[PDB]
Ligand binder design. Structure first.
Ligand SMILES: CCCCCCCCCCCCCCCCCC(=O)OC[C@H](COP(=O)([O-])OCC(O)COP(=O)([O-])OC[C@@H](COC(=O)CCCCCCCCCCCCCCCCC)OC(=O)CCCCCCCCCCCCCCCCC)OC(=O)CCCCCCCCCCCCCCCCC
Ligand SMILES: CCCCCCCCCCCCCCCCCC(=O)OC[C@H](COP(=O)([O-])OCC(O)COP(=O)([O-])OC[C@@H](COC(=O)CCCCCCCCCCCCCCCCC)OC(=O)CCCCCCCCCCCCCCCCC)OC(=O)CCCCCCCCCCCCCCCCC
Ligand SMILES: CCCCCCCCCCCCCCCC(=O)OC[C@H]1O[C@H](O[C@@H]2[C@H](O)[C@@H](O)[C@H](O)[C@@H](O[C@H]3O[C@H](CO)[C@@H](O)[C@H](O)[C@@H]3O)[C@@H]2OP(=O)(O)OC[C@@H](COC(=O)CCCCCCCC[C@H](C)CCCCCCCC)OC(=O)CCCCCCCCCCCCCCC)[C@@H](O)[C@@H](O)[C@@H]1O
Ligand SMILES: CC(C)=CCC/C(C)=C/CC/C(C)=C/CC/C(C)=C/CC/C(C)=C/CC/C(C)=C/CC/C(C)=C/CC/C(C)=C/CC/C(C)=C/CC1=C(C)C(=O)c2ccccc2C1=O
Ligand SMILES: CC(C)=CCC/C(C)=C/CC/C(C)=C/CC/C(C)=C/CC/C(C)=C\CC/C(C)=C/CC/C(C)=C/CC/C(C)=C/CC/C(C)=C/CC1=C(C)C(=O)c2ccccc2C1=O
Ligand SMILES: CC(C)=CCC/C(C)=C/CC/C(C)=C\CC/C(C)=C/CC/C(C)=C/CC/C(C)=C/CC/C(C)=C/CC/C(C)=C/CC/C(C)=C/CC1=C(C)C(=O)c2ccccc2C1=O
Ligand code: HEC
Ligand code: HEM
Ligand code: HEM
Ligand SMILES: CCCCCCCCCCCCCCCC(=O)O
Ligand code: FES
Lengths: 185, 204, 51, 535, 58, 102, 86, 26, 56, 56
């Protein structure tokens, strides 16, 4: 039901055609229906289950870990190759890509790496224990809601937006000023 | 004063002193030495490298492993604090260990001398790109492709990590693996070729 | 020693003409604002650099 | 009582150094007033700011690879093992009041420097300001460009983060040990051993703060001295010859303009360094051999070199148990564009067989072949630059990553040819556009509708008229021509006054009269001078 | 014509709009796959979530 | 060198259009001074201290460097604008010709 | 004249019917450079089919582009030879 | 050119033996 | 080391009113510190030689 | 002065020597001191250069 939760809550299922990669979209079902589908699937072979809370609901707040530094350096080694430094997009082989992590709630982040949706690998509970996963999700959630220091973020990719901003703002302003001061012909 | 001979024997191995470029962290230091495949788990003050079992990684997973000997360990003291740092900063140290689905085991091609370098459905390859040395570690587990995010060369896992796209011309190196009497993963020796980028006096 | 009288007179005339023709001395309002602004900018910049 | 104060301190200087004639000469130097000639000083103004910011970042930085544990104020990196350089770079940004602002201004100025150099180079190339006797100046500028590129590359490699480390491992280490004979000797000489070593960051620091800026300063000095003593070229126009300069004197018009331009450049750079984020090193981590991210981009002035690597095929050779890697092809290639750049004037001099001591510029439309070649080169540069960021374009815009490589690979042989053809034709068409106005006149955009039902357009002749009313054809003199009637004064001032209230009529009449008379005087002076020159 | 400088703009709007709509074939997904009629709900975020359809609309 | 043209920018001695331009230059110069004073005050009195995450006072910290950049840059640019406006409104215009003995 | 325009007189230190300002700068590239350039570019496009790629769409694209280039060069050469263009 | 010493095979290959390990440095 | 400790640290903090402030500005804290050698290196290889060259 | 900049490291980070000069083998020192020892003992002709520097 972890796979079902991830695929239906994020809207990937049901899929609509066969291409390089199925995109995410608005969900088709709600929480009750999601749980029903998950339980129906779980009764036909077993497998992973979504973590719950003390009230029987999906755990969101309890999945946030304490240590953000250990989560950060686990993310940088295991997850920053496909995703970005802070969780932006990344291109894959042919028509495929790793999405942005700035929209997923803790349960979604937890269940993404528990099952393995697509060309993303799966991290079992023995490879990454369900304590390191909490730190990873904490890092992912924090690096998405922290404001930029020193001005506008410019997307968070680095040299390319910086270069384009330079060319389209600084040089344009400089040339305009030069044309104002100087003369023609 | 800044002219140095690169082909000078400085590294002690199980066969005498050897040049730097011929060796790595996986080279045996004496005959019958046990090198464990360790993983980076915790903080520097909390035993950063620990042992691993074949049961930990499942089908369609990948892990990064490092060479760890019993002679280092914990890093609590100052003697093992500089020994655990050399392992993590080694140029040719990291290895990617992948587990292949049993359904896809009939389409594996070996490399004429590396026919016994795998333990069932576990394979281990160098994590260093053979083009310019970037960590080629973008592993697509359905298409079974290893992608380098530096110059966009991808390698085929089902074959002997031979390039299929990009500016790479050589295949990734394989490390032979097996299990220990306790049930931990160990090596059957080092690579049978140099790892990393090429140079003028490479190959026979 | 001293350059010939012609050079001295011509250079002095050039500088004096440059200052006088600008009509800056006749305009007290803008001649004072410039000084005040430059002083303020200098003070701010120096405090930021050293502080 | 400053009249007596300045008269005493002026005599004290003349009686000791006697620099009367020497400074009087420098106050009377005439400089042409064209916007395009202000492109060169921006770079200069960018260099000065790079020095002031470089001295403020020399009081806090520690270049060392000694590994430490952070234990600082920034919580997400608490307990992580890094180097001394990275820790000090974090300290500058988090512990010193206004350090982040200073280093952001440093980086922004670094970008502006290269951009300005590129634009200035384009100007010099297209107008033919390199012909004679100004070849050595071109060469010096070429060397300056190369030095600026390498100076910039060594700069962002100092913090020792993940991006810079990955870049320096692939570029400075991977490429180095590919050169056929001296491949590994040179590598071990540069790094003092294997790749990481322990002396690379100190060596790069000493190279970045002392040597390359010194060479740059000397070369800039030589450049400016040559420009000063070789009497800056001008453009064809009314009253311009091969043996004079038309413009304004240094004192006081030129100096005020230069100062104001410097102030505005500083303003723009300072404003840009506060509102936009550049190079956030804390979002990255310390460099580790077994870690990587998705982007991996150098700065824009180094992007074409990186894009050349991505597009060239995997062609290698294996003679007598040796190896010639792919990386060789770029190393030869990269030094081949440089060689063709420095020794261009001699190539063109040999081709066209012309060397006649030119002082008057050329409009790019008048030289089609050179314009086409320049356009082709710019197209190739742009394509190579956009090929380096093919992974970012494939993510943001929905296109295959495999498709981008092939697009670039095919494009780098096809697009330049198309650009050449289009540029050639466009230049000739712009030429033909000038011959239409010298023959018929400026089209006013007014239709007449004659009695017999014919439609004609009213033309405004630019010279004497024939007895039938058709204008006398004029000759081309390498100067621009008007094409709109509003630029010729077909439109007065709306009226003297504020934006909301008018002024008394008499003031408006007097001001209009004065302005008109002043325009007559200026035109008459130019015409008289032009008439006396050609006697 | 009444407005020539406006008459020129229409041709360029035509050409560039057409190019933007046709350029959906460069994407790995493809162009619009829901007919010229574009019935709903088949063009909603849920059904036809591709980028070709967006370029078609715009 | 020979100056073939030079003329004062205000021939008519007393007019209402000259005072307006003088006031415009004065306003442009005053703005730079005010911005410089603002820079001095904001550099001395502002939080400027790093705030960890999701804490009160994090918002005010994120505006420190932006305010520095605004204040230094709104002043010098304004002074530059004021100084260039003075060149083309009050300085006489000239056309000088010099022969190059090359 | 009641206009503001000032006429310029200048004297600095393929024919004018094809390129109006033919005597003001370099305005002729010899034919044969361009033909050989085209053929060489086509050869390069054709030779890039030797690599490590496993697809064939790119190969067909390369073949098509090379064919187009060769056709253009051939047409130009034929028309220049036969006398219809100069 | 193709790299010599990079060849595919059709040999089955055996499962690796259990590691014993010589006790101490020789 | 002893030369620096005596002639640059002891004398600096002996000056009236503005004495301890100047010491802590130069050393960035107490005497040993962590930024003295880099600062002296930058001052020795870049700034003072530059001024000397210009003045010469 | 330039030759010396290719080898020197101005840091106060404390290390243990472990070099060629035996009387200082296990001593706790700084990076600057270690590098200064390296210049004089490990680089060919370094001692001569740094002696000429001081004499000049
Ligand atoms: C939407 C398009 C709206 C255009 C409507 C024009 C129809 C009238 C025809 C006409 O008189 O043509 C004049 C003239 C045609 O040139 P011409 O052929 O030489 O005609 C000679 C005239 O006789 C010479 O006439 P003139 O020189 O005396 O100029 C008269 C002309 C121009 O007089 C002006 O000065 C009016 C201001 C210009 C229009 C400003 C529009 C700005 C749009 C950007 C919005 C911001 C975002 O007056 C008008 O066009 C009056 C119309 C009122 C304009 C209000 C439009 C608001 C836009 C709504 C946004 C939503 O066209 C114009 O000058 C303006 C046309 C605008 C075309 C732009 C199309 C792209 C718009 C994309 C915006 C998307 C936003 C996101
Ligand atoms: C993808 C494209 C790949 C090509 C990229 C460059 C590689 C080729 C480089 C080369 O070696 O060129 C050979 C050759 C070298 O000689 P050249 O440098 O031209 O020497 C100057 C000649 O004296 C110049 O003499 P000429 O140009 O007077 O030669 C006579 C003839 C030259 O003939 C042609 O160039 C081909 C014209 C016939 C085909 C077009 C008609 C449509 C098809 C109907 C079916 C006919 C059967 O001109 C025409 O008849 C052209 C008609 C012009 C009127 C405008 C109407 C165009 C409407 C388009 C219809 C849609 O160049 C050419 O053949 C001219 C074209 C230049 C190639 C690049 C520009 C092509 C135009 C853009 C296409 C890209 C689309 C996106
Ligand atoms: C000389 C002058 C020099 C100075 C000029 C500077 C001016 C620019 C800015 C002004 C300075 C203000 C200083 C205060 C800074 C501040 O207080 O900081 C706010 C926060 O802001 C962002 O937070 C957004 C939300 O607030 C967060 O909630 C959210 O999380 C966050 O999301 C990120 O993170 C997620 C992870 O969870 C991801 O999922 C997600 O994707 C994303 O990455 C958000 O980010 P983002 O989308 O960037 O915002 C978009 C910006 C959009 O900017 C811009 O206008 C773009 C500026 C750059 C343009 C240059 C590009 C050049 C392109 C070329 C033209 C290409 C083509 C040509 C080439 C080919 C040519 C041939 C054809 O504004 C908008 O919202 C909408 C647009 C309205 C802004 C308009 C203002 C200026 C426009 C100029 C013209 C005016 C005309 C009218 C317009 C309406 C993030 O940065 C945060 O760090 C940051 O904290
Ligand atoms: C903005 C900034 C950061 C700048 C910092 C500036 C600064 C401090 C400078 C540092 C220098 C830098 C950084 C430059 C780097 C240059 C560089 C990388 C070069 C490396 C050098 C190298 C590899 C070494 C090779 C070794 C070698 C072969 C050495 C050869 C020695 C040589 C060639 C010696 C040249 C001697 C020489 C230049 C002498 C000039 C003598 C002069 C100028 C005297 C002039 C002069 C004379 C002669 C009088 O007698 C006299 C008498 C009375 C009044 C006046 C004068 C007078 O003016
Ligand atoms: C790899 C390589 C060789 C490059 C070329 C690849 C390629 C085929 C390019 C197509 C790109 C596009 C536009 C794809 C969509 C499909 C499409 C519309 C195709 C063509 C349409 C057509 C033929 C006709 C329409 C006419 C027309 C003029 C179209 C306009 C299209 C334009 C101008 C779009 C921009 C093009 C482009 C590649 C821009 C790059 C800009 C970059 C690199 C910036 C990166 C960047 C990013 C990523 C930020 O996140 C960011 C955040 C905040 C501030 C700034 C930035 C920022 O600058
Ligand atoms: C740290 C931190 C907070 C930030 C970094 C700080 C930083 C980067 C500093 C930059 C400072 C900087 C570059 C400031 C520039 C200031 C400028 C250029 C202002 C000048 C504006 C101005 C009024 C220019 C016009 C020049 C004029 C009026 C010339 C008058 C004039 C001059 C200048 C003579 O010297 C002279 C000598 C002999 C005879 C006659 C004259 C004469 O007429
Ligand atoms: C390369 C392969 C990787 C690696 C090593 C990781 N991820 Fe990510 N990831 C990848 C892809 C191609 C996709 C898309 C699959 C789908 O859409 O079916 C994803 C998806 C995710 C998601 C869900 C998307 C979302 O809703 O934003 C998350 C939360 C996610 N990935 C996180 C994540 C983490 C935490 C990883 C390391 C521990 C990680 N991924 C590795 C590609 C790849
Ligand atoms: C003039 C051309 C120069 C360019 C283009 C240049 C460029 C750069 C760049 C791009 C960086 C790294 C930016 C970052 O991400 O933080 C940098 C760092 C640095 N530069 Fe320069 N630089 C130049 C000259 C100088 C000079 C002359 C000095 C010294 C006088 C200097 C001192 C430094 C210092 C100390 C750093 C420290 C790195 C940091 O604090 O981030 N630079 N330079
Ligand atoms: C740091 C880089 C450079 C600086 C600071 C610089 C500065 C200047 C300045 C200020 C001028 C005179 C102002 C002007 O006419 O635009 C000038 C002139 C010139 N520069 Fe540059 N320049 C640089 C690089 C280059 C380059 C890259 C070239 C050419 C490759 C070049 C060639 C010239 C030439 C030929 C002139 C003569 C100007 C003329 O004749 O009109 N310079 N340079
Ligand atoms: C430019 C010349 C290109 C020649 C390509 C040669 C290909 C060699 C292939 C190997 O194998
Ligand atoms: S470094 Fe891996 S492809 Fe170039």
């Amino acid at each position: 039901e972890a796979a079902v939760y991830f695929q239906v809550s994020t809207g990937r299922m049901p899929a609509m055609r066969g291409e390089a990669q199925a995109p995410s979209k608005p969900p088709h079902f709600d929480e009750s229906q999601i749980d029903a589908l998950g339980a129906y699937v779980q009764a036909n072979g077993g497998g992973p289950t979504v973590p719950r809370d003390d009230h029987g609901a999906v755990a969101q707040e309890s999945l946030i870990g304490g240590d953000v530094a250990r989560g950060g350096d686990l993310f940088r080694l295991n997850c920053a190759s496909c995703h970005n430094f802070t969780g932006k997009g990344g291109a894959l082989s042919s028509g495929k890509y790793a999405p942005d992590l700035g929209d997923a709630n803790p349960a979604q982040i937890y269940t993404a790496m528990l099952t393995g949706p697509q060309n993303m690998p799966k991290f079992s509970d023995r490879q990454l224990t369900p304590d390191e996963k909490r730190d990873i999700v904490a890092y992912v959630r924090e690096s998405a809601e922290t404001p930029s220091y020193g001005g506008y973020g410019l997307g968070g990719f680095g040299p390319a937006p910086e270069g384009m901003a330079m060319w389209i703002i600084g040089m344009v302003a400089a040339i305009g000023v030069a044309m104002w001061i100087g003369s023609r012909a | 004063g800044l002219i140095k001979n690169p082909w000078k024997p400085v590294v002690p191995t199980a066969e005498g002193k050897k040049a730097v470029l011929w060796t790595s962290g996986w080279t045996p230091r004496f005959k019958g030495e046990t090198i464990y495949l360790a993983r980076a788990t915790g903080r520097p003050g909390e035993s950063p490298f620990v042992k691993m079992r074949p049961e930990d990684i499942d089908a369609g997973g990948m892990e990064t492993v490092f060479p760890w000997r019993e002679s280092d360990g914990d890093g609590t003291t100052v003697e093992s604090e500089h020994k655990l740092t050399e392992i993590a900063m080694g140029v040719r140290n990291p290895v990617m260990l992948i587990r292949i689905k049993p359904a896809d085991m009939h389409r594996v091609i070996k490399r004429k001398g590396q026919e016994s370098f795998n333990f069932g459905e576990l394979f281990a390859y160098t994590k260093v790109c053979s083009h310019l040395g970037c960590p080629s570690s973008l592993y697509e587990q359905q298409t079974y492709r290893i992608l380098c995010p530096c110059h966009q060369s991808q390698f085929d896992a089902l074959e002997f990590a031979k390039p299929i796209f990009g500016p790479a011309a050589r295949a990734l190196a394989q490390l032979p693996i097996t299990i220990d009497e306790d049930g931990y993963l160990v090596a059957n020796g080092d690579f049978v070729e140099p790892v990393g980028p090429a140079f003028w006096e490479r190959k026979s | 020693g001293r350059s010939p009288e012609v050079h001295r007179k011509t250079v002095a005339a050039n500088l004096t003409d440059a200052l006088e023709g600008s009509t800056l001395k006749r305009r007290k309002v803008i001649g004072l604002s410039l000084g005040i602004g430059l002083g303020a900018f200098g003070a701010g910049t120096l405090v930021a650099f050293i502080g | 009582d400053f009249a007596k104060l300045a008269a005493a301190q002026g005599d004290a200087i003349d009686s000791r150094y006697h620099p009367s004639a020497a400074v009087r000469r420098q106050l009377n130097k005439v400089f042409p007033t064209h916007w395009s000639f202000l492109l060169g000083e921006i770079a200069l103004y960018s260099f000065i700011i790079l020095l002031l910011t470089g001295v403020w970042l020399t009081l806090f930085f520690d270049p060392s690879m000694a590994h430490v544990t952070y234990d600082g104020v920034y919580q997400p990196l608490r307990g992580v093992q890094m180097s001394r350089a990275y820790e000090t770079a974090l300290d500058i940004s988090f512990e010193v009041r206004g350090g982040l602002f200073v280093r952001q201004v440093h980086h922004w100025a670094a970008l502006m420097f290269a951009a300005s150099i590129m634009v200035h180079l384009a100007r010099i190339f297209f107008t033919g300001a390199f012909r004679r006797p100004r070849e050595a100046n071109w060469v010096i500028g070429s060397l300056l460009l190369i030095l600026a590129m390498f100076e910039g590359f060594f700069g962002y490699s100092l913090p020792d983060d993940l991006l810079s480390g990955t870049g320096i491992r692939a570029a400075l280490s991977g490429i180095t040990m590919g050169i056929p004979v001296i491949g590994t000797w040179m590598h071990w000489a540069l790094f003092g051993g294997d790749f990481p070593g322990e002396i690379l960051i100190p060596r790069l620091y000493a190279l970045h703060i002392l040597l390359i800026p010194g060479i740059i300063l000397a070369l800039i000095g030589a450049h400016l001295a040559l420009v000063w003593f070789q009497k800056h070229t001008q453009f064809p126009g009314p009253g311009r010859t091969e043996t004079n300069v038309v413009g304004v004197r240094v004192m006081p018009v030129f100096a005020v303009k230069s100062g104001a331009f410097f102030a505005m450049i500083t303003g723009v750079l300072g404003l840009m360094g506060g509102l936009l984020t550049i190079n956030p090193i804390w979002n990255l981590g310390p460099y580790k051999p077994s870690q990587v991210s998705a982007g991996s981009q150098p700065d824009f002035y180094m992007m074409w070199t990186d894009g050349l690597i991505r597009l060239w095929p995997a062609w290698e050779f294996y003679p007598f148990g040796h190896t010639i890697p792919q990386g060789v092809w770029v190393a030869v290639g990269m030094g081949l564009v440089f060689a063709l750049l420095i020794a261009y004037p001699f190539i063109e001099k040999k081709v066209t067989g012309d060397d006649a001591h030119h002082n008057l510029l050329q409009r790019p439309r008048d030289v089609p072949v050179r314009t086409a070649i320049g356009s082709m080169a710019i197209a190739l540069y742009l394509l190579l630059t956009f090929a380096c960021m093919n992974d970012i374009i494939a993510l943001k815009f929905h296109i295959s990553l495999n498709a981008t490589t092939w697009i670039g690979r095919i494009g780098m042989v096809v697009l330049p040819a198309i650009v050449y053809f289009v540029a050639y034709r466009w230049a000739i068409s712009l030429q033909r556009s000038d011959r239409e106005v010298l023959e018929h006149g400026v089209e006013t955009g007014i239709i007449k509708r004659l009695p017999h039902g014919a439609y004609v357009e009213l033309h405004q002749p630019l010279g004497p008229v024939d007895e039938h009313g058709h204008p006398i054809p004029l000759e081309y003199a390498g100067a621009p021509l008007p094409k709109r009637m509003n630029k010729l004064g077909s439109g007065g001032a709306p009226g003297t006054g504020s934006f909301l209230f008018p002024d008394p009529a008499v003031e408006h009449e007097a001001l209009t009269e004065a302005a008109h008379a002043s325009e007559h005087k200026s035109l008459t002076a130019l015409k008289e001078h032009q008439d006396r020159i050609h006697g | 014509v009444a407005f020539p400088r406006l008459n020129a703009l229409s041709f360029w709007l035509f050409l560039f709009g057409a190019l933007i709509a046709i350029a959906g074939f460069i994407t790995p997904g493809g162009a619009a796959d829901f007919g010229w009629t574009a019935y709903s709900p088949l063009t909603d975020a849920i059904h036809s979530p591709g980028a070709g359809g967006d370029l078609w609309i715009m | 060198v020979e100056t073939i043209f030079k003329e004062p920018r205000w021939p008519v001695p007393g007019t209402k259009a000259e005072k307006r331009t003088e006031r415009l230059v004065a306003y442009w110069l005053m703005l730079g001074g005010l911005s410089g004073l603002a820079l001095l005050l904001v550099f001395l009195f502002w939080p400027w201290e790093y705030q960890p995450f999701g804490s009160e006072g994090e918002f005010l910290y994120s505006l420190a460097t932006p305010l520095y950049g605004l204040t230094f840059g709104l002043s010098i640019l304004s002074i530059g604008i004021g100084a260039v406006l003075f060149q083309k409104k009050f300085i006489p215009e000239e056309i000088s010709v010099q022969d190059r003995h090359d | 004249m009641s206009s503001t325009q000032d006429r310029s007189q200048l004297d600095p230190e393929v024919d004018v019917e094809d390129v109006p300002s033919a005597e003001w700068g370099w305005s002729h590239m010899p034919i044969g450079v361009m033909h050989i350039g085209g053929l060489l570019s086509a050869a390069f496009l054709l030779v890039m089919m030797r690599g490590n790629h496993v697809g064939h769409v790119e190969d067909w694209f390369l073949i098509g582009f090379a064919a187009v280039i060769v056709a253009l060069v051939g047409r130009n050469w034929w028309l220049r030879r036969r006398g219809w263009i100069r | 050119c193709s790299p010599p010493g990079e060849t595919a095979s059709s040999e089955p290959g055996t499962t690796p033996a259990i590691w014993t390990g010589s006790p101490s440095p020789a």
